[PDB]
Amino acid sequence: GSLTEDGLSYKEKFVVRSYEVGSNKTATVETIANLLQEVGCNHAQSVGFSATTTTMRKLHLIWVTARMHIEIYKYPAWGDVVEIETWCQSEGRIGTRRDWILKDSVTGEVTGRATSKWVMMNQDTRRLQKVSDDVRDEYLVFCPQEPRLAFPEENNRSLKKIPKLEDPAQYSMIGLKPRRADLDMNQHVNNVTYIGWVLESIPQEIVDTHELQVITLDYRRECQQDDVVDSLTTTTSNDSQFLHLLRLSGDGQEINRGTTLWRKK
């Protein structure tokens, strides 16, 4: 991987692995979401981060994901090479945005795109806060100054408000627990696990006859290593649409809400 000529974005190529593919012999949406993490971390490292700034580390401040929106046109096949380009952008005091473009290395065509929204949180108190100018000026030199949007469209799916699923749900997967392989290097549940957990309540018949096209996921609360999760889904719709809810098996505390769009194979 490497930063582009202007040093305002980062590119990296990935060969799709044998264990990274599903039943259709193409990369899963969780494999893709992991590749977005890998290109994201390599972009931060190539510009001095390790992505907390000097001031964030001093104040015990971290960047946390509020929303992830992924849209896939063609999932890459096992053995194919996918090139991913990523960049960040400031959104005032609310936080930052990280976008991605996925391409076929052989054809140069766009096979997918993603956008994520990040907010600042105190690592210990878990309290959110608006970005301070001292922190803001530290990373503004690594972002483009003109708007560069993976989803520019006048009316796009990445900014839609997601409602809360009403009980009873149509489908459900109960008693989901994270294992050590679901944890990151800081012993927190990896954000991609939640994507997998949302998809767990989609019936196998939809999974076998449709391909996931769009997924929007809001992150409200973290699932701890010793928590149990319930995954709920209700059909809201040639296209299938679903409303999703992740909550703690006990009290029913919400951790995530989302929507998926699937098209017939």
Ligand X SMILES: O=C(O)c1sccc1-n1cccc1
Residue 156 is a catalytic residue? no
Residue type, 72: I
Among the listed residues 241, 260, 211, the one whose alpha carbon sits nearest the alpha carbon of residue 75 = 211
* 184 lies in the site for its own copies, by CB under 8 A: yes
Q: Where are the alpha helices (DSSP H) in 16-119?
A: 29-46, 54-58
Options 34, 143, 156, 188, the catalytic residue: 188
- State how far the Cα of 255 lies from the Cα of 245, in Å rounded to an integer: 8
Q: Which residues contact 167 (CB under 8 A, 6 or more apart)?
A: 232
Q: What is the footprint of its own copies within residues 71-90 (CB under 8 A)?
A: 78-79
**Least Å from the CB of residue 68 to its own copies:** 14
223 is catalytic: yes
**CA–CA gap between residue 164 and residue 253 (Å, rounded):** 12
Q: How many residues bind its own copies (CB under 8 A)?
A: 35
- Rounded CA-CA distance 52/62 in Å is 6
Applying the rule CB under 6 A, the residues between 3 and 42 that interact with ligand X are: 33, 36-37, 40
- Rule CB under 8 A: say whether 154 interacts with its own copies: no
Catalytic residue flag (residue 186): yes
- If one asks whether residue 222 binds its own copies (CB under 8 A), the answer comes out as no
Q: 161 touches which of its own copies, ligand X, none (CB within 5 to 8 A by kind)?
A: none
Pattern of binders to its own copies over 158-177, x per CB under 8 A? -----------------xxx
